[PDB]
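In the laboratory, one determines a bound structure by crystallizing the protein with its ligand and collecting diffraction data. In a computational setting the workflow is compressed into a single prediction: the sequence and the ligand go in, and a structural description comes out. We illustrate the idea with calcium ion.
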Amino acid sequence: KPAVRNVSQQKNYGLLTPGLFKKVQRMSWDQEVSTIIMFDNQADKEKAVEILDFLGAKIKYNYHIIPALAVKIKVKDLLIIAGLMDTGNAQLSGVQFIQEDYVVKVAQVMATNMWNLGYDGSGITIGIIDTGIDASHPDLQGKVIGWVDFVNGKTTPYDDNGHGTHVASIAAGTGAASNGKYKGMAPGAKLVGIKVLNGQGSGSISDIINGVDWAVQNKDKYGIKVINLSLGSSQSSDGTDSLSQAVNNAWDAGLVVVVAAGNSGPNKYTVGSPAAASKVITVGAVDKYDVITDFSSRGPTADNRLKPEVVAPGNWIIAARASGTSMGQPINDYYTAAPGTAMATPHVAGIAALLLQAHPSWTPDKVKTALIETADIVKPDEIADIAYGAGRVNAYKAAYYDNYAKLTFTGYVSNKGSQSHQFTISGAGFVTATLYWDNSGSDLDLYLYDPNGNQVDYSYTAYYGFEKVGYYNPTAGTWTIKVVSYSGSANYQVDVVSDGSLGQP
Ligand SMILES: [Ca+2]
Ligand SMILES: [Ca+2]
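The predicted complex, in structure-token form:
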């Protein structure tokens, strides 16, 4: 196993992130800097408005989804609230941290959707947080029921880049212009266009958070159940920055949040924000043969958590070409092909919309679980780990989750102990077993044994989140799962899922 990192758990310069502290060290007093101030709660955030007005700092946003302000502030003034420059002497009260509001930037071709399903995401609305949507594209017409433009303030949908349209169509395109061939994963779903990225595909953290905020504020009005963020930076993140917090909070408000892993692989620790947010679904990219792409970002997070959780097709994906744009590699007037974890992301968002159509009562955690547990183990010796996560999502299995046999095991393992559980299986094309546990400081591993008692799969990442094993055409008989503490104790749960019959001996 890879030796791990630190840890370590106290790194900020008072209120300033290290990155922001360095930034302002090279600046002079009268210059301006764009920041996000995260407070410990909403009332503390509110108290600070009057003080920031006094100093003449300019509040760009006052957020609901996080207790934070997006603030443009002179260095001298920022030194004052940071407690680094005495009039106080005191740090601004109730501040958790102040970060930089920095800028985010975004052939064998293939269709996104290789399935025919009974569901199509009817009655579900997906928010596309991106460059916009070309709602005049034949595959999207009448779909865009909601719209906001935080870049230019235009009040009618458009897309001046191409990226957001391509993404929107992978998620929910009807495929009308190819008679279905390049439909998205959720052809019956509605869309809301949330433009936070400019024509160059660039945007500020503050704008992206505001787009997440808007989606949450407006979730009831437009029936938003899923949001899509095909955007991020890839500076290794621990998922505690303002944008990560915002997407985690949006998850808790009841939205399925689906985020691109990033395109900065194959190196490990290339998962940044908001890819690192623990709660959301972070999505890597495979090519058309189910092989992880070289560019797909690898985890773990900066704090050693397992990311991405799943991967999806993200290499030269054909989808809607926004009127007047030419992103990637044009196929014809209506369609263009592009690679990226940005293409993988909406594939998963649309599947999420199927599942929510199929199961109106499912929470986001339930959607995430079904995706993880049903994902195809396309590369057994690398699953679960920080390139493939749990494997490549399978829209058919995810959507038909409930038709499958299930078995749940639980127990406790002490430091370096194990537990085993036998189960019987027959008539199966597949079985998977997925392991969770409570103690995030503990590393548990998962092993799967055939009826001869021989190990046919293992899952032993060092990085905490889950473990995942399974087998295709498992021979009928009594199989064993073993839960092993590599280090540390925990209470655990293993879900076994199969299309065969599942029993106990
Ligand atoms: Ca494995
Ligand atoms: Ca492990």
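The domain at 13-102 is CATH 3.30.70.80 (Alpha-Beta Plaits). Keep in mind that any predicted model is a hypothesis to be tested, not a measurement.
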